[PDB]
Design an enzyme around this catalytic site. Structure first.
Site, PDB file in Angstrom:
ATOM      1  N   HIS A  41      -1.704 -33.854 -11.993  1.00  0.00           N
ATOM      2  CA  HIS A  41      -2.462 -32.592 -11.831  1.00  0.00           C
ATOM      3  C   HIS A  41      -3.037 -32.152 -13.181  1.00  0.00           C
ATOM      4  O   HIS A  41      -3.765 -31.159 -13.188  1.00  0.00           O
ATOM      5  CB  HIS A  41      -1.677 -31.507 -11.103  1.00  0.00           C
ATOM      6  CG  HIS A  41      -0.609 -30.832 -11.881  1.00  0.00           C
ATOM      7  ND1 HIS A  41       0.716 -30.867 -11.489  1.00  0.00           N
ATOM      8  CD2 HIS A  41      -0.656 -30.061 -12.990  1.00  0.00           C
ATOM      9  CE1 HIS A  41       1.433 -30.153 -12.332  1.00  0.00           C
ATOM     10  NE2 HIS A  41       0.619 -29.630 -13.242  1.00  0.00           N
ATOM     11  N   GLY A 143       2.341 -24.427 -18.597  1.00  0.00           N
ATOM     12  CA  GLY A 143       2.324 -25.378 -19.720  1.00  0.00           C
ATOM     13  C   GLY A 143       3.572 -26.248 -19.796  1.00  0.00           C
ATOM     14  O   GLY A 143       3.541 -27.200 -20.613  1.00  0.00           O
ATOM     15  N   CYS A 145       4.871 -28.131 -17.444  1.00  0.00           N
ATOM     16  CA  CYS A 145       4.729 -29.331 -16.574  1.00  0.00           C
ATOM     17  C   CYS A 145       4.761 -30.589 -17.440  1.00  0.00           C
ATOM     18  O   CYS A 145       4.228 -30.591 -18.549  1.00  0.00           O
ATOM     19  CB  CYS A 145       3.485 -29.271 -15.707  1.00  0.00           C
ATOM     20  SG  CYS A 145       3.513 -27.871 -14.554  1.00  0.00           S
TER      21      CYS A 145
HETATM   22  C1  LIG Z   1       1.030 -27.408  -9.708  1.00  0.00           C
HETATM   23  N1  LIG Z   1       1.621 -26.183 -10.243  1.00  0.00           N
HETATM   24  C2  LIG Z   1       1.636 -26.130 -11.701  1.00  0.00           C
HETATM   25  C3  LIG Z   1       2.171 -25.176  -9.507  1.00  0.00           C
HETATM   26  O1  LIG Z   1       3.106 -24.531  -9.961  1.00  0.00           O
HETATM   27  N2  LIG Z   1       1.676 -24.935  -8.229  1.00  0.00           N
HETATM   28  C4  LIG Z   1       0.324 -25.303  -7.810  1.00  0.00           C
HETATM   29  C5  LIG Z   1       2.510 -24.188  -7.265  1.00  0.00           C
HETATM   30  C6  LIG Z   1       2.616 -24.801  -5.852  1.00  0.00           C
HETATM   31  C7  LIG Z   1       3.078 -23.727  -4.878  1.00  0.00           C
HETATM   32  S1  LIG Z   1       2.109 -22.313  -5.357  1.00  0.00           S
HETATM   33  O2  LIG Z   1       0.811 -22.384  -4.748  1.00  0.00           O
HETATM   34  O3  LIG Z   1       2.850 -21.088  -5.211  1.00  0.00           O
HETATM   35  C8  LIG Z   1       2.014 -22.750  -7.087  1.00  0.00           C
END
Ligand code: A1BNP
Ligand code: A1BNP
Lengths: 306, 306
Positions: A41, A143, A145
């Site tokens: 991502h 950040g 990740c």
């Molecule tokens: C990919 N990252 C960095 C994330 O934390 N997400 C998109 C979450 C998935 C569930 S959400 O839409 O609450 C946020």
């Protein structure tokens, strides 16, 4: 004596953390040999995250679009490939700090250390368990990740986790180092359901053995039980069912303390039915489930790494 | 989000740990520049520990009696001196891994990371607070002595603790890196009294701010209080008295959340009088006091080291 939630020493993993940037997104990568591993991502804009087509997004990316920085040094990217939900960036320089290492996929109930990082720099280290619903309860900000979870076996680092996301409920999801998510989660900004967070029964019993070893004995009772009787009570309290494999794993702790596993189960059964009545066990007011039986043996016997 | 008991990354300190042996006693030393620091009780036999005359014991020791090992390498000892309760062993080789560093004497309520070691090898890392009775609640077995506590400020390691002993009650005592004990403790196998272990009030309030930031809000009440009213309740529950200096330090957290420090004190007052009624805050069933206000800001804003 004393008993603490203890992480592995982090130095071996600190030497592997780098910063990966693709356009306006920066996160962490893991540099082992001449490969940098990071969450795929990294290629997404916040807009992309709603419904990403990673294959289509990846077509617009060339080796020179992945900016990899190891402290002050830029690494040269000579190849890239997508494996499940991770990118593998081939660099022209093998990490000179690469430890002996393995990629392992852990089971729910198993523990590991997280080295929380931002922009390829370590901020902190803490101990996590893979929850039975395949979430972890971490500490991750924007950040973080690409931060990794690991175990050490003397001189070999077993990488078991890479951080990818937060659920709307504030729990954490990620992958093994082949890029397969733990649990049913996807790298998409969609509403995703964590199921029931059950308690890791075998880990609670291990920590009760740790308490006894460390002189915290008030909860030891006069009763025993059976696996079926205990499990009928465990179910009602959203405890994981205890199996004979679990009894077997607790054998060495049973032997050290002279407390039969089923006697310890009867103590746990009373703690569930009656609560702690305002008392503590190893300084906790609740039953701790993020120590494995291996963790307790390790900490109580002072095993070393290098 | 999420909030964890998080240690500093340990790599900088791992590179400083060595094994010190004198006769049949082995423990850990800290190798910085061309000095190795260790507990002076390395010179004692178990018999000596009952009533040691360290000056007299030291007369029988020469440089060649201190065996210092850095992984596989023997270090050559060219001088030794006793400073309070530590030995300084001068070696002919400066540690090539020496970080930027300082020796600091911390105040009760301040937190630090311990790198627990055996035979100069790291076993684990955890976060501790200096208790108001100048004990720490650690995890130390035989051989862990000379393990250090530290804080990191970007690239500089501030060493604040060296492990020396366990009280009969299973709590831990040690020195700063000039060899002065925290609290009234001595390096002698005599019965020694820990006083009252009071709760670090300012740290509880900081963690309540962390809870709010992380969506754990159920305990916020409709009341306010004053410093004198709150303190009359704090005293009864063996909480440290809260001062205007403490209110000042919580200012940035008050500003981030929009909750006045005195409103948060009124919430804490109700939690003390009424308890948690079986609920949790950041996954604890008791009020956590081993996060400083600086710790909360740091973790909630993702500050980095290298
Ligand atoms: C990919 N990252 C960095 C994330 O934390 N997400 C998109 C979450 C998935 C569930 S959400 O839409 O609450 C946020
Ligand atoms: C110096 N060391 C390694 C110790 O732990 N002690 C002698 C304790 C002091 C109090 S005690 O006598 O209970 C043991």
């Amino acid at each position: 004596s004393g008993f603490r939630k203890m992480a592995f020493p982090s130095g071996k993993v600190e030497g592997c953390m780098v910063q990966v940037t693709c356009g306006t997104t920066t996160l962490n990568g893991l540099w082992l040999d001449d490969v940098v591993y990071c969450p795929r991502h990294v290629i997404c804009t916040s807009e992309d995250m709603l419904n990403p087509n990673y294959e289509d997004l990846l077509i617009r990316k060339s080796n020179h679009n992945f900016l990899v920085q190891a402290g002050n040094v830029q690494l040269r990217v000579i190849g890239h490939s997508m494996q499940n939900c991770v990118l593998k960036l081939k660099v022209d320089t093998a990490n000179p700090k690469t430890p002996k290492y393995k990629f392992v996929r852990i089971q729910p109930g198993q523990t590991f250390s997280v080295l929380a990082c931002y922009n390829g720099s370590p901020s902190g280290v803490y101990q996590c368990a893979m929850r039975p619903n395949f979430t972890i309860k971490g500490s991750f900000l924007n950040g973080s990740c690409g931060s990794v979870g690991f175990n050490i076996d003397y001189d070999c680092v077993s990488f078991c986790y890479m951080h990818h996301m937060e659920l709307p409920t504030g729990v954490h999801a990620g992958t093994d180092l082949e890029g397969n998510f733990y649990g049913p989660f996807v790298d998409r900004q969609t509403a995703q359901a964590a199921g029931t967070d059950t308690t890791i029964t075998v880990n609670v019993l291990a920590w009760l053995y740790a308490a006894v070893i460390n002189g915290d004995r008030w909860f030891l009772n006069r009763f025993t039980t059976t696996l079926n009787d205990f499990n009928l009570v465990a179910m009602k309290y959203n405890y994981e069912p205890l199996t004979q494999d679990h009894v077997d794993i607790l054998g060495p702790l049973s032997a050290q303390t002279g407390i039969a596993v089923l006697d310890m189960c009867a103590s746990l059964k009373e703690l569930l039915q009656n609560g702690m009545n305002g008392r503590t066990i190893l300084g906790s007011a609740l039953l701790e489930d993020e120590f494995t039986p291996f963790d307790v043996v390790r900490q109580c016997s002072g095993v070393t790494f290098q």
